[PDB]
């Protein structure tokens, strides 16, 4: 039934956004940080469940679920309430060719990042390719949010593409990489980004 | 003349996007971009990705995105699950079909002129399907009740496999039978000629 354990380890990225998922949604949502030593247990089970110990990973008695995409519409299909997509199939499409984007340029950098045996030189070319394109990007993940805001005032649906935006952000702090920009106006927003309960309640 | 799909010839991609487009019956243009201008080519997809889905004021391409995309867009007969369990894991196994199984095919699509390199990759990917046999028996399509872009990905998969040579046959068991009668849908029958 509703034995929903979501795997994740400490600092991954990945995890804390899908935590802020499960916690938007409303999720029953029983944590299993196999980071930690106690839950060695655990993770056991996961390297049996899944292939590479994937994390995070959202298991039941019924499914084992990996990769991001799949994870996210999968809380979509248990969770409806509140929406996560937009409407219309052109956003929807859009939005997941987004995600794509933000996943390889991001997300699957920021964790190389977090490789012990890096080199200086590669993991310094990582931290600046970000820097060029945070920017850019961010305008992206707005111009988009605005369209699927107003073309559905009534529906009120919650933009997914913002609020792993703002992941990227709090490691970008938290890498101690800068987000090149002298834009006040784009500053408040990435305070407020920042700012918002449901992500302090997160990473908290 | 609602919405245009145009098509590169060998890609296993356009295939399985003009088996999606059948079973949604919905009436939309095939195009050869081999048979158009070097110059409007550039004008409906400048990176020039295959296949491509136009309509009166969007257009799409986005390998991951395409199908999932035509599903949504005409929306009957869902070519998803619709028991949630059900869908849930059918969409980690798309995921697995294009980063694990199409690499297989591109990969036999490259090293396709040295024999010493293909006789060893056949070896193994016959050694896999064989390992896999065991999971097959027990449904007509795909590990579901209906017909899933799962039958989509495949069908095009097993063909264009088919076409660099690898061939299916009676040692698969339940594959050579599922592998039957999913060239037996009308949806496949046509995108393969
Ligand atoms: N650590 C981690 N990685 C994730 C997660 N979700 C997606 N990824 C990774 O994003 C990368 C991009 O995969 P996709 O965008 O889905 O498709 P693609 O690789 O064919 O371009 C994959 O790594 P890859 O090495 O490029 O391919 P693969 O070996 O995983 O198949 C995939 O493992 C996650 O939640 N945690
Ligand atoms: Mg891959």
Known sequence: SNAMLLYTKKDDIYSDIVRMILLIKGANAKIVDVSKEENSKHLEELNIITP?????????????????????????????????????????????????????????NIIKLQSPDLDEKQANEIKMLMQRDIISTYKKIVSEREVNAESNPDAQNINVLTLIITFVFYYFIKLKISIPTKDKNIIKEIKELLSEPNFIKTIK | ??????????????????????????????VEAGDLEPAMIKKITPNGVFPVLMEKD???????????????????????????????????????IDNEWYPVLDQIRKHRSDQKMLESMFKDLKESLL????????????????????????????????????????????????????????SVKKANI
């Open chain 1, 52 to 108: 590479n110990g994937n994390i995070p990973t959202l298991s039941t008695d019924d499914f084992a679920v990996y990769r991001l995409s799949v994870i996210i519409e999968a809380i979509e299909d248990l969770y409806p309430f509140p929406p996560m997509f937009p409407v219309f199939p052109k956003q929807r499409a859009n939005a997941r060719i987004l995600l794509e984007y933000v996943n390889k340029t991001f997300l699957q």
């Open chain 2, 1 to 30: 003349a609602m919405v245009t799909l145009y098509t590169t010839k060998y890609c296993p991609y356009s295939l399985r996007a003009r088996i999606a487009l059948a079973e949604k019956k919905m009436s939309t243009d095939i």
């Open chain 2, 58 to 96: 969007y257009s799409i391409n986005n390998r991951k995105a395409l199908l999932i995309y035509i599903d949504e867009r005409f929306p009957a007969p869902s070519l998803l699950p619709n028991v949630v369990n059900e869908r849930i894991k059918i969409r980690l196994s798309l995921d697995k």
């Open chain 2, 131 to 186: 390992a896999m046999e065991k999971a097959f028996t027990g449904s007509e399509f795909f590990i579901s009740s209906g017909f899933t872009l799962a039958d989509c990905y495949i069908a095009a998969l097993i063909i264009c496999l088919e076409a660099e040579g690898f061939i299916i046959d009676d040692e698969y068991g339940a594959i050579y039978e599922y592998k039957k009668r999913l060239f037996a849908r009308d």
